[PDB]
Amino acid sequence: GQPVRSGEPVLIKHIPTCQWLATDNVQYNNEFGQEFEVFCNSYQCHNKTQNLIAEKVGRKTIETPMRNQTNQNTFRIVTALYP
Amino acid sequence: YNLPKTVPLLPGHCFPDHLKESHHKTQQFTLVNNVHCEKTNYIEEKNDPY
Amino acid sequence: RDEDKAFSNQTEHNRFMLINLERQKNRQHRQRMDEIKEFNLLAAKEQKIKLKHMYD
Amino acid sequence: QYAYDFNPAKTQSLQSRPIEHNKFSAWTGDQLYRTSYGTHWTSKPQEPKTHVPPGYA
Amino acid sequence: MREVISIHVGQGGIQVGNACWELFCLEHGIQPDGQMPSDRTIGGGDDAFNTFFSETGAGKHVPRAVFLDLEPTVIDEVRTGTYRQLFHPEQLISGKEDAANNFARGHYTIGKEIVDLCLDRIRKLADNCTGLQGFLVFNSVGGGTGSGLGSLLLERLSVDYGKKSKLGFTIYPSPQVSTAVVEPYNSILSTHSLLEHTDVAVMLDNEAIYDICRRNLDIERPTYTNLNRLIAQVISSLTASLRFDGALNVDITEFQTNLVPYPRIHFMLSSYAPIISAEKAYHEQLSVAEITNSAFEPANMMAKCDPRHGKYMACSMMYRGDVVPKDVNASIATIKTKRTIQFVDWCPTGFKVGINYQPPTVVPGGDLAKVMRAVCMISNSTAIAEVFSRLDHKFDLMYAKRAFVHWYVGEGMEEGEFSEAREDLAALEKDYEEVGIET
Amino acid sequence: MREIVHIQGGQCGNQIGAKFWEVISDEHGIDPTGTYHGDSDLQLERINVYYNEATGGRYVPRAILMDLEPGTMDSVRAGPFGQLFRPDNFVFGQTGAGNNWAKGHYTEGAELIDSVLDVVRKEAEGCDCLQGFQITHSLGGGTGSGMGTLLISKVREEYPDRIMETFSVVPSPKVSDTVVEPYNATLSVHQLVENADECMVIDNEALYDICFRTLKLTTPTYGDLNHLVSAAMSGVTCCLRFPGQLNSDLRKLAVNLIPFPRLHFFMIGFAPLTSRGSQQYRALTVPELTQQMFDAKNMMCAADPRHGRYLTASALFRGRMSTKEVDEQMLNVQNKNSSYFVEWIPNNIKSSICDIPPKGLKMAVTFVGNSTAIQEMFKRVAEQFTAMFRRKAFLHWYTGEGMDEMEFTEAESNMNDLVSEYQQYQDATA
Amino acid sequence: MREIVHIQGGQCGNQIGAKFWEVISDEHGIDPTGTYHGDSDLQLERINVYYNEATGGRYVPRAILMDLEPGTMDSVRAGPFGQLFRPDNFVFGQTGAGNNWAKGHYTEGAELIDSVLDVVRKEAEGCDCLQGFQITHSLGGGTGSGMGTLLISKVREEYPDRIMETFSVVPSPKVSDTVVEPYNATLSVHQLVENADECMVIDNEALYDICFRTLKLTTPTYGDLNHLVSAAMSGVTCCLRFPGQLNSDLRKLAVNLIPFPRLHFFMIGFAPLTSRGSQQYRALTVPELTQQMFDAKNMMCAADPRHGRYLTASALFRGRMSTKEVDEQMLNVQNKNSSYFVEWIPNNIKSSICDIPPKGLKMAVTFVGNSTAIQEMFKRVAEQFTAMFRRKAFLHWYTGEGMDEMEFTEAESNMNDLVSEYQQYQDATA
Amino acid sequence: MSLYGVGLNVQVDRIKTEFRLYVSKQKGGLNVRNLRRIFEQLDYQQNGQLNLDDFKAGLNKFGFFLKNVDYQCLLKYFDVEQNGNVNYLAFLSCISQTLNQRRANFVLKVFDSIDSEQKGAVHPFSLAERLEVVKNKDYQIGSKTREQLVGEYVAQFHKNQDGLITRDEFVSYYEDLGLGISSDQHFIEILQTQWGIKEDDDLAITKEEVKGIVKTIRQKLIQKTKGANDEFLLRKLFKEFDISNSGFLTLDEMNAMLIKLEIPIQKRYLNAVFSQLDRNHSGVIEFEEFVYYIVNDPYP
Ligand SMILES: Nc1nc2c(ncn2[C@@H]2O[C@H](COP(=O)(O)OP(=O)(O)OP(=O)(O)O)[C@@H](O)[C@H]2O)c(=O)[nH]1
Ligand SMILES: Nc1nc2c(ncn2[C@@H]2O[C@H](COP(=O)(O)OP(=O)(O)O)[C@@H](O)[C@H]2O)c(=O)[nH]1
Ligand SMILES: Nc1nc2c(ncn2[C@@H]2O[C@H](COP(=O)(O)OP(=O)(O)O)[C@@H](O)[C@H]2O)c(=O)[nH]1
Ligand SMILES: [Mg+2]
């Protein structure tokens, strides 16, 4: 419910899949030189957190995320410098 | 719509909080000469030129 | 109108959950801050009584 | 968003609300109004008498 | 209207009183003059101090305490010390000649000229109180005027007031550590005298506290000032329910009604947790589950007695801080399950819990750490029978040759008191044995 | 018309009454200063049941608070909504009870109860047409279990026609809050079975279980426990204050719930209750309400209902709902679990409907049921009492006030006979 | 309306269940939040089969997640699509089975299954007319095998009339994960024969072969393997949720597939399957589909059906098509390969048509058949069991908690009769 | 009933439904426009504010009665400035429908028929001439005081400063009349009988008809040739006659193309499926999109 500012890192996620848009150092060949690929994947941290036992005791809730992510999901919107 | 601005109290939703600096109890009720009496707090006036 | 009543009434429960979750998130933040408070003074007092034990 | 509030309509206590003043006679617009006559034609205290009949005692 | 009047007799009582009364002054915000801080300027003054302090009408506060001693040295220190203007001038009674470690001196010959003066002062303080809950007494059993006057005052109070509750924080001699030579003689004589005159007695021997400071507070050379600070904390938690609101309040009168199965069985030993320095406080989380377990450790007790050698008849514990009724219940259930701790058969329900909101206060220059939870536990058990037996053995060792008895018989007491006092103690030794066997 | 006066004693009684009066003030839209600020007309028609009227148009509850010590009274006066109670309704002593039934019933409460009896007499004569009394007290405490029981007895011979209601916090040995609790519990039960018209047992273990497994909140408090108790209290009497499809007061509840006069011990439960993190998945339907109603873990007592047979039960519904749906659910739950209901009475469930739901909700219900499974608590209390009385430990404290062991023996025998006759109907068959 | 509940046991069942619910939600267009966003109205007509309605119009799956240790369910909750499952449907212990059949069936399963049995009983009560159950678990694990098969026994006793399905992944001996595989695989089969209405055998070797040879995937992962299982699972009940020219539920398949009650072990296949580099060059038609359907390399089991005789078979068709070609294709393949079909049952093929194809494809076919070649899988399991059992290796763990060798003897004894029963109904001729 | 939060919206909705039901049931001389012309007499100063007593008196005069509590909810909702007085203008702003499109279509065409000289305004006597002609066959053209004698059939409307009525009010009066009547067929019959004009569209193609038509198309193709084929067959017509090779399909070409494969769709039916298929609205559709929708679509 808060306005989105231009410039800071953000996240873009698909609503039917809950998968964050991502891009990695994966080579791809095309007429426009060499460029990488864009796909959807959640680059979450590998370490597991005992969320289920936390829920039953009553310490945390589902909507609040518990696992960090890697910066491959970070995107930024860039606008024009001059009017 | 008309959504309530504040949470309504419910069997487990009041949640009293007790993180104060000092939990002191004031002696407001006193029994003297086998007669009940209480302090006159919340009632005092201050002054006026009346 | 029955469909409208269902949507209008369930929205109250939606707001209801958000209030509780937000304030509960507030309470833990304050209580955690009070735990930082305790070890703040204790850390100082450890370096305090260390010198006092050397003398007397 | 916010917690639960106790006082509705923002009713300030009369303790700080202005000061006592000369309205002690608010009810006594009809206090020396007897009802043996009266409340038969009038509802307000009767004027001081100017004339009396014989044997007024 | 919940006032307690404390009695401090002997050097042990007075030196405990100094540490005990500096905590109350700081806890309720009173400067050493009895006056509130000059600047202050908050408003809405709370008269929670009425439990211990009394208002003079305009200005200072005067404690509801009395100090007794026959040697003038320790009192003169108080009258010259930091708190000279706090106590009333004529509520510090001082004698001229010491009792000199003799029970008879302070009970028959020279203690009768002082006991009249104190009873006059006690009546004036009691007449001032409107809701007097009871009396607290502090005395050292292994001393002359400590046990002499202490026994005389308790006897006089029994007929002067009667049903008023009286609590006793005695200081019994250590099993092996000793400062005098004739402690067993006046230990029994005092114990027999106070056997039928006190309501609740707590053992406060010194060697246990020496071990606690070394083990927990990392102090290798403690002093009596350190010990008196720990004892005062026990008192503060014990009476904290009368002046700080809590979820479940407890009263002084609700101690002798639960921890005393029989009139002759009123001896009990106390424990306190967490007694910890900030060395280990920075690491431990100090949860309510952890503190309630540490209170039952025999090494953490305030008396040189092992509860593992006897049964538990009743236990009362008080929680202060941010405790929750959830975890108090859960941890207590675990204690009942533990096989290492067992209760007597005829007492299936064996606890009493008190909850208070005020966290413990910290004294500047003190040794304890600042915490959020604390528990004080008072338990009556059968294991106290061993301290009497060991104290009995030393008395029988001396009394065979009638040593030191001429120092007593010539000071107004008869020879027969030694036999009956020993006779009375002997019955109590296996009296604890009869109550502890299964039906 | 058919108003009820609220009288309470003891620490637990004072706290429960404070929470209940706060809940009632919120429900009726009364500000902390006592001035009506409701928005609908229905919140003013029946305000006379609980609130009196003073000058200036303010309302003061007809509540009486008693205690041998003013500690909890002092604590509750300074709290929120503490200004509603008039100072003349506060009666207090100077000594205290000390968790002693003898002290609270013979030597202190007996000499102190004159003033509170005067106060309750004044209130009863002041009210237009009294409907009954209700009690909140603790059986395990001294002053409560003594003075409240003695007051119950006295007001019972004085008003033999009015109804009686009690909310007793019976002790559970798991939380051994007081070592001398069996004596007080058994004596209070012996006194209560003779006079009390309704009894509702409340257990801290059941409240803890509810607050831990249902609400899923990390820091339970006596505030939350008292809120649960107060919601249960208001649910049973909502229909007396608001209109509905079927009206049912306390007299009708007793009539439709108690089979025999000595069987007047019930268990209560409130629905719906859900966690913050699980409310988004549940629905709001009468079948869900009634399936949570009969869940064993939802009860406010230590007694487990599926170990016994439901003699009679009653439900009081709040909100706009359908008679079809409610009575079909009642019939279905009665038919599918025939082993859980006694056989020689058909249709042993009563339904009541109120059109006004609690604020912030659309449907609610309160369940009161007389089940033969409560005998477990009585048997456990009696066995602890007899085990601790064989050695007659702690008996001298009670004997010092002139009591005699003949009364103890008679109370134990009455409790045993109550347990025997209460178990007899469990195996009874036609 | 003939809805089905889902039970997920073991580590494999949790992973199989996670992907299956992703496909079903996709097939009905359900977002991870729970709000319907489909394109056509047919996706909402029969949504009640798998989803329960909640507040706000969201849908929740009626699936129960069960495991002794919550390590596996911990990862699935935090990942995508971890929000659909209601938190009340997760049950977990504190120890874990650790590939010990008896520990998960006698010691830990016994004291834990009370909770999960209550939950599934509630779910079956809520539905108006239950249609059947389905269980996904593993016979090579501890929690999947022991506590998983015990719950089957309990619900079978309580619901003796409903149909039950199991998607059992019996591990293969070519490459194995657990060294105690023969024990807990053998015991589970003995308990599964007399309680499961149908059995759906899945082997890891077949899954790996399809990906490498048919899909030509150089780096397959369990995510790919779980999808192939999930695709077949939805195809079995596709006609129950969508309209079609011929209707067939789970019960109808049971009638036309099981000649005798003990012969209820099927083997599955799914068509079509092609790589991305070959989609353009292949035209999808009914003759093309039925050719891959009967190919032995396509089926989900390591058992080669060419070594036995097809007792019965059933084919489910998805997608719009006429009926003449479907009828004749089943006829022609029956005539030309008569050597692979037993004779004493004429026309042993079942055909069904559904007109809603899966997303991304125009036509799909799910194949379930009863073949005597499945006896070979039992033979090698008994072969490995007796080789390990003759030395009593690893037996101290099984008999350390009350299990006796008498159980092992009958477990293998029951297997021999099943192997013999299939062989007798393979050479018999009219 | 416990109007704590959303309850205000529910109860006022109940009141609005009750009022609509009442007015629709009586169906007769009473009208919503009759209510507004009653309020201003009680308004006195035209402030737009009325107290609870006057508001209750006015509603009771119309013949509408509610609960004592129900009146409180209306005041609480419609006292926007919290002066203790309801806003009858706001009350009449609600419980007013926007009129159905078919009703709007019929009322607009009648006004167009009356106003053949396209100014958007109609002289009052011109209307009253028509209302009198339809009512009898012997009225005759001439009358003694025809203007004032026949103007009583009109002036239920209102006129602007010029003296002519506007199209805006002509619709406005009829949509006010559309609250006492809740039957579309009865409304159309009343209007046509009043105005001597009965012209409307027969029907519109429905989603069920579109689904049936498209199922007919997709099934007819399958019968031809084999499963892998018929995509080439569909593309073959476009190859045979798409001269410009642009790749766009027109309505005329699609109609003729479907004529070739023994599928003679009606023009109205063909328009409906054509309009449903495209969303760009230029009248041209890519052939690839058409063949995709026809062949490769999981849903009907
Ligand atoms: N724990 C503790 N014990 C003390 C303290 N001061 C004195 N004692 C005890 O007091 C006992 C001896 O008594 P005294 O200190 O001489 O004072 P007394 O009890 O009045 O005896 P008299 O000398 O006859 O007056 C010693 O055995 C100590 O155990 C103290 O500060 N802390
Ligand atoms: N539910 C609930 N129980 C309480 C509360 N306060 C006290 N209790 C219970 O009351 C018991 C003690 O009662 P007590 O204070 O001795 O009663 P009293 O002697 O009449 O004042 C404890 O076991 C508590 O469980 C409360 O606010 N809520
Ligand atoms: N098809 C499939 N099999 C799996 C998956 N994860 C594990 N397995 C198989 O499960 C077997 C191990 O089962 P195990 O975890 O011990 O079962 P549990 O003890 O009941 O939880 C291995 O042989 C794996 O091949 C999966 O995601 N898909
Ligand atoms: Mg000395």
Residue numbers in the entry:
A (entry chain 0N): 198 to 280
B (entry chain 6R): 3 to 52
C (entry chain 2W): 225 to 280
D (entry chain 3A): 3 to 59
E (entry chain LK): 1 to 439
F (entry chain LN), G (entry chain KN): 1 to 430
H (entry chain 4C): 1 to 300
From the publication, what sentences describe this entry?
The core structure of motile cilia, the axoneme, consists of two central singlet microtubules and nine peripherally positioned doublet microtubules (DMT). The assembly and stability of the DMTs are indispensable for the ciliary function as they serve as a scaffold for numerous ciliary complexes, the force transducers for ciliary bending, and tracks for intraflagellar transport.
In addition, we obtained the focused refined DMT structures at 3.2–3.6 Å resolution of the K40R strain, in which lysine residue 40 of α-tubulin is mutated to arginine to prevent acetylation. Since the mutation does not seem to affect the overall MIP decoration, we performed many of our analyses in the K40R maps due to the higher resolution. The mild phenotype might be because Tetrahymena has the species-specific protein OJ2, which might have a redundant role in ciliary assembly.
